[PDB]
Amino acid sequence: GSDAYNEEMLRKRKLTVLELHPGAGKTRKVLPQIIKDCIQKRLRTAVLAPTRVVACEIAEALKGLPIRYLTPAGNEIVDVMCHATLTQKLLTPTRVPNYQVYIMDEAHFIDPASIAARGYISTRVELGEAAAIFMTATPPGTNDPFPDSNSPILDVEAQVPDKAWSTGYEWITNFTGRTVWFVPSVKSGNEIAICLQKAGKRVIQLNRKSFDTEYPKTKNNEWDFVVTTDISEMGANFGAHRVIDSRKCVKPVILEDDRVILNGPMAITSASAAQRRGRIGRNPSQIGDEYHYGGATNEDDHDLANWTEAKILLDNIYLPNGLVAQMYQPERDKVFTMDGEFRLRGEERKNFVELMRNGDLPVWLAYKVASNGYSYQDRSWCFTGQTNNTILEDEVEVFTKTGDRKILRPKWMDARVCCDYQALKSFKEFAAGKR
């Protein structure tokens, strides 16, 4: 694919993918060119970043242009927001400008709200109401683990250990410079960190929890190893020389529409493998950048909660005249449910929104509660299943809004609300009517 923008990509019915090499040297000389042109042509433009990190990067690039920065809360016709901000506005009937132009950065993001916004955007574009530009090193549909790069990358199939080692693995410990090592879980990373410091290496550990505090500590490069989960596949830049990829993740997976579990280690998609690899090969300067990788790559991931969630969101975004919001074309092969299967109506839909918005419940859980006639402030469903016992140690008592010391045992189990301590406590709060 190509990285070259031209102004013909802004006429209505156009959907373009700019396949950019990872670097600031293109996205942040390109995005401004597109935005200047949208201003030149008086086009109501929406610019969509995956995370808060990438929006503050986009804002920097566009400083001194008339841009409005949106959040969940007059001369500017160009609005910057998170993928999730768009999808939220769509779900919760809040007025959104008739955007003639959507620019989605990291348009591979496999996050329920991203998929669903790609679905809505592509639909509007098909109908002749808008143009769209999706920017991504790894477009949906592509299946290439080793894409184009800025510098050459040396790709190396290798024995990569998932726990500490005493002997062997000279290649890992010899290395002069700087390594990003992608792991499935923190515990696996913890084990590997300790092994590394028992070879006098210095290791920053990045995960969803540690990220905001530790990501900045790597910016000054006084480290030999960053040991990271898939948090670092998106909006995370390093001065590294090589990448070691286990080629594994842990994902929320649906078993049985009756249980979501966190299943791993399993094999990552080719997009994830490309993004992990994509931390190196960024600077034409640095030529001996390497990528040592473990297991194989797998695109059969229908099981993932994320794909059912995206579809739940999409079915609940409304369009005039019996039109059907479909997924971006390359991602339709992931949805197996009928169009409008998950559509909720009136009371059920308002509760669905409030349970995600004010409830902080996963899309899947929120759907299951609203699906079954249950209201926002009714929490009876938390204590009226069986063998769905959440446990601290050995059985979690809770002190309700209205009396009892009821035992917590919800009708539906989502691992994502009892996988942490902050997760569980937050879910305890919820059963207890206390938000």
Residue 46's nearest CA partner among 61, 18, 32, 67 is: 67
Question: What is the distance, to the nearest Å, from the Cα of residue 287 to the centroid of all Cα atoms in its chain?
Answer: 30
Kindly write down the DSSP assignment for every residue of 149-205, as one continuous string.
-SS-EEEEE----SS--SS--HHHHH--S-EEEE-SSHHHHHHHHHHHHTTT--EEE
Q: What are 72's two structure tokens?
A: 């969940």
Q: Is residue 228 a contact partner of residue 210, using CB atoms and an 8 Å limit?
A: no
Cα separation of 268 and 299, whole Å? 8
**Which structure tokens are listed for 279?**
């931390």
* Resolution, Å (one decimal): 2.5
For residue 237, with 0-12 CB atoms within 10 Å meaning exposed, 13-18 middle and 19 or more buried, which class applies? middle
- Measured between its terminal Cα atoms, the distance across the chain in Å is 48
Tell me phi and psi for residue 292, to 5 degrees.
Answer: -85, 120
Nearest-angstrom CA–CA distance, 250 and 216: 25
Inter-CA distances, 348 with 37, 87, 351, 429, Å: 43, 18, 5, 22
Determine the Cα–Cα distance for residues 275 and 296; give it in Å rounded to an integer: 15
CA distance 334 to 140: 11
Question: Do 247 and 292 form a contact (C-beta atoms < 8 A)?
Answer: no
Q: What is the DSSP string of 384-431?
A: SSSS----S----EEE-SSS-EEEP--SSEEGGGSSSSHHHHHHHHHH
Quote the CA–CA distance of 143 and 298 in Å, as a whole number: 9
Length of the chain: 435
d(CA 233, CA 237): 9
Domain ranges of the chain: 1-142+301-338, 143-249+265-300, 250-264+339-435
Determined by X-ray
Question: CB–CB of 385/409 below 8 Å?
Answer: yes
User: Rounded to 5 degrees, what are φ and ψ at 379?
Assistant: -115, 15
Structure tokens that stand for 157 in this block: 């199939």
In this structure, the dihedral spanned by the alpha carbons of residues 335, 127, 98 and 340, taken in order and rounded to 10 degrees, is -30
- Which class for 327: exposed (0-12), middle (13-18), buried (19 or more C-beta within 10 A)? buried
The Cα–Cα gap between 58 and 429 comes to: 36
> CB–CB of 193/227 below 8 Å?
yes
Give the residue ranges of DSSP H helices in 44-137: 52-61, 83-91, 112-126
Distances (CA, A) of 119 to 70, 326, 327, 366, 404: 21, 5, 4, 21, 45
| Residue among 148, 175, 174, 154 at smallest CA distance from 290 | 154
Task: Single out the residue of 130, 149, 123, 115 nearest to residue 3, CA to CA.
Answer: 149
